[PDB]
Amino acid sequence: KKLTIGLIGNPNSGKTTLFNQLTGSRQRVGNWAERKEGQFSTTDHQVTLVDLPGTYSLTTISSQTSLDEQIACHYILSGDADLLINVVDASNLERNLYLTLQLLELGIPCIVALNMLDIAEKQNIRIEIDALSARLGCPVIPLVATRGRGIEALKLAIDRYKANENVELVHYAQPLLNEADSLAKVMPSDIPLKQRRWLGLQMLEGDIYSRAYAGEASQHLDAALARLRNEMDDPALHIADARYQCIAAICDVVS
């Protein structure tokens, strides 16, 4: 059974190194129409690993997006990957989980690969693996460097992979969910309900680039925002703050 896996993480998360270790000399360097692609095997699977450009987020709310960011986003939303391996820097967890949260809100099958365990230890940081997994609703695999043990556990997890656990991640105010869902109902229904509801939130948060994916929902954004502004100060801020609360709450328990 062949699997297509996207490798995604922040810049300087050790992603290039992990890609190289996983694929060895079974790799091929193309471009996105630089696009690195490689092969490896697990017990059950022949995996095609696709290296996505380093990025801190699938989008940018307050400022201009980058090319790398748009490439990652488009690939992720295309649904070409059967699952993703989200490489996370254990020494800068809070910053790294911003991207992770987006992947999980999108409902994309995910395996977190906790990297840079050494540097975390030398920064006096210990991550509670099962605490994080429980809260994210996906596997969390410590990438132990010694004798490539982390790689072997990562391959094990790929063979074990099922859907993410359907867990509440962010706790949004009810008017936000309502408005996002009603926007979602009008978006191109070729997109899954979960992603259309996320796009909805992104629109409400001021994400300009999400409007490209939302089609006819953009015609209803103004009316949704006016309503929300009559029951809370600034809907975009309530979205960002809830997301900050979620990630901060996780980090306090987990780190």
CATH 1.10.287.1770 fits 170-255, yes or no: yes
156's CB contacts (< 8 A; 6+ apart) are 42, 43
| Residue 106 in tokens | 């999108």
What CA–CA distance (Å, rounded) separates 126 from 90? 8
Estimate the crossing angle of helix 174-184 against helix 193-204, to 10 degrees: 120
What CA–CA distance (Å, rounded) separates 135 from 168? 8
- Residues 10 and 95: beta-carbon distance below 8 Å: yes
The DSSP H or E segment spanning 129 is helix 129-136
Using the CB atoms, write b or e for 86-108: b if 16+ within 10 Å: bbbbbbbbeebbebbbbbbbbbb
The CA-to-CA distance between both ends of the chain, in Å, stands at 37
Q: Is the dihedral of CA 201, 205, 209, 214 positive or negative?
A: positive
90's CB contacts (< 8 A; 6+ apart) are 114, 115, 116, 117, 119, 120, 125, 127, 142
Give me the resolution in angstroms, 1 decimal: 2.1
Return the domain boundaries, the chain: 1-169, 170-255
What CA–CA distance (Å, rounded) separates 119 from 223? 49
Backbone angles phi, psi at 36, to 5 degrees: -95, 130
Technique behind the model: X-ray
What CA–CA distance (Å, rounded) separates 22 from 124? 28
What CA–CA distance (Å, rounded) separates 224 from 178? 10
User: Strand pairing partners for 39?
Assistant: 48
One CATH from 3.40.50.300, 3.20.20.60, 3.30.930.10, 3.40.640.10 for 1-169: 3.40.50.300
Query: Do 1-169 and 170-255 show the same overall fold?
Result: no
Give residue 50's region: left, alpha or beta (phi > 0; psi -120 to 50).
Answer: beta
- Residues 111 and 83: beta-carbon distance below 8 Å: yes
- Residues 7 and 84: beta-carbon distance below 8 Å: yes
What CA–CA distance (Å, rounded) separates 174 from 167? 17
- Residues 204 and 224: beta-carbon distance below 8 Å: yes
Determine how β-strand 46-51 pairs with β-strand 35-41. antiparallel
